[PDB]
């Protein structure tokens, strides 16, 4: 439904300032983080797509600032499926 | 008049983003203006001759159409561009200060300091105060866009005295080269709270 | 206010001429003024000092009585005579456009193109208005005259796209190089027909 | 608006003093405003943008108080402090022409000569207009203070054709350099006295 | 709510000396620790912003003294979608 | 708990000119002065930390044009031995 | 609120002959003296600015004349916290 | 009670503008003028301190233009016995 | 509370044998081990300030031998919202 947008992160505080840095910077919603283990964290917000464009572009900049970025995506329209398996925010 | 407010009523699109156009000229102010919203559905807010001979274009709509209106703006002022701005979020307090300047009547009965920033363009006291208004919960007070001063436009904003700072610290990053002067009183006697302008 | 209507009642002498003086100054704005009334009986229309610190002196009378009026202040002025203008003649449309900034509301159903043209002078404004508005059927819509915009002056006229073209070499030939840009819009949007300056 | 009175009433302290301030820039206006009412208790008549973008501050009270109060600010200003004026006691007929810019519209029927004088600095303007009022009888019709004419400010006194020669004489030398024209009429014709600007 | 400031430290020892150092340099509230694996551990303090400020200018100094700083970051303004989806210490 | 701070003049007109450009540069409050004679006075503002930080900062260089600054501190976080034990405004 | 004025002098008799200067030269009122110790005594006069001008600008010289001058300032409206606070003859 | 200041112009001229000059540059009274003899002319303003210390400074500057000021002085606060013996303009 | 000492080291054994050697050679308390995941682990001893010097100064000593010692720190009086907020086995 709503597109995606994901930071992930190798470290918290990177993170954290990112997920900052999307919901100031456009009208999306962090609905939370994702700890995969080895320091990686994943910040994920979730709105119409060239809102979490803007957002992710300026979460980017802002997580190479104070952490180690290491992938930036946007989804601009996720199937079904991914919503209903993985923890996206908008399980039903 | 009711163009400028934050939030929409229920039957209306939510537009959230802003895109400011100062141009050195008025002519191709025009020209600018209907080449953005022939390409791009936007909600054109102002199209106003302000002080100093310029043109002051400001423009409201969705993400994707203020931003594929300002790119057709700004190719066609290719030029007469003197600054450009396109927020995709301004912030809630920003809407009803674009209009028409607006001065401040009375402080709060808790506010410690104020800091007044001055730019040189328009687009870049739009961008700061937008800036300081994020990563900082002060209170914007009052804000004059280019009439009446030739071209400068300054705004002012009120808060706790380490807030004002860390606002003042993203203003002077934000501005950089645009900054005239910016003054952090944290102390403001009791002679001119929240009568300032007057 | 009924001083500048383009004609006069019967009870009144037919005053066709205009003379404009744009002067640096504002005190021998005034000597040029009371010069320019005491060798010969013009109407003075206005004597305002407007933006950018500059003075601008609009007379009306008959062809003979301005014509004397004028040398005698382009004589006591020359100096301080930023432009001056004289107009045998001025066009019934231009009578409205001087003492207040219009601005248009609305155009029609069926107006085609407009042009809109900025000159750095005031006497090149009215001058470019008059030629424009006397070899083409075009229609004057709005018009500043140097106040708010800092000494430089507008008009925008609307019609077929042919006879604003013709309107267009007609302003281009006589403002020459007082002209800062002028735009012939060939199809403005439905967003903004009437309703430019807002 | 009952500040800007020259007696006060009688349960009022009786405030003589008068100190301009005219700042390049508007932050440290503010600045330079509240650091004067920290320092000695003056009453602030205003704090206002005036045009070409630069900041006016008037303040009023006793000869002490206002002497300190200018001390502090010439201190916190320097920098942006374009001109400055301290009166220790300014003329009665000044008063009322600082708030708002007044034109005066009907002369009294003996009224012979007119000098109208413009001055680059509104310090000069009240400076050299308060010189003239002491060493006159001559009367104050009209005055403007830098906002419409981008910083420059005028006035116009009138009375004997002597006197206002003798006025000439102390504007000339107390401006000296500020003063960017004066014109001395030594007869304004029948169809202007009273009503120059219009 | 209060502005934040957090130290990463691979490592729980300089972690431990990083949050004393805060919560004694400044006036602070040390919310707690986030372990994002790995070794990787971000104390997170809380309070306004110039005592965060001074807070994390006196950590990162004192905390490389100890052990190895990933990042360092003050933000003097959590967005309240942090605050709500991310546990800093202020979830109502 | 609040933050302190302390402008120590030798003299006592450097010590008032000092804590009145404290309270007027600043939103602190004055708690007094400390007397150790031999002329030593210390003039003790006391508040949020960048307010006492400011506040100094602005005695200490109106001190100077006047009389003589021996000594110029702030403490953002003062230990609650040193409020209980030694006069400095916040004695419970 | 009543404008200050301070004669500090290294000895008891320079300070008497201020303080007697200062109430002789203009319309002030002597409120009192404060001894820091260490010799150093200050004459404290406080009344109009005008007045507290002129007495302390007369006080300064005639007590260069018998003692040792250390400072001498005026302030012309101090603030309220320090009349609250400090010992200057306005406490309400 | 009122503060004193006088001109004291060698020449009726001098002592004229002077006299002009401080009646008009302050908000002083000029109480009258007094003939010595020898040539020596005295203007007496009497009015508050600083309206007389600006208006005999101003008389000063206007007076030595056109004449030969002997002497200026300004008495902020003159005894009763001055004013009671003394023609100057105060007299019970 | 009590004085704090830790060592941290990539390796369960290395750990085992520092905390052996820290509580062999004082009285000390030794409260347990935190477990930061990627084969970090720290071993916290806890009693007055020479025990425990004397306690994590021989346990360095003898973890070098068997482990990668990563950081060795010593804390002579934590803060009471550390030992509030994190866990070093004196939690109220």
Redesign the interface.
Known sequence: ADALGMIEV?????M??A??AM?????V?????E?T?????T?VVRG????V??ATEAGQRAAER??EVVAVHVIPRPHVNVDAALPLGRTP | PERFDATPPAGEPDRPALGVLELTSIARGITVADAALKRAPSLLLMSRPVSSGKHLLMMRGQVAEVEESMIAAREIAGGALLDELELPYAHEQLWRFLDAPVVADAWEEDTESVIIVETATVCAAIDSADAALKTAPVVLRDMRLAIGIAGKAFFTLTGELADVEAAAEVVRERCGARLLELACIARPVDELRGRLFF
């Open positions: 190798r470290g918290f505080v990177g954290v300032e997920a900052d919901v100031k910077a456009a009208k919603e962090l609905i939370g983080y700890k283990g080895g320091g990686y964290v910040a119409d797509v060239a809102a464009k803007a104070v952490g």
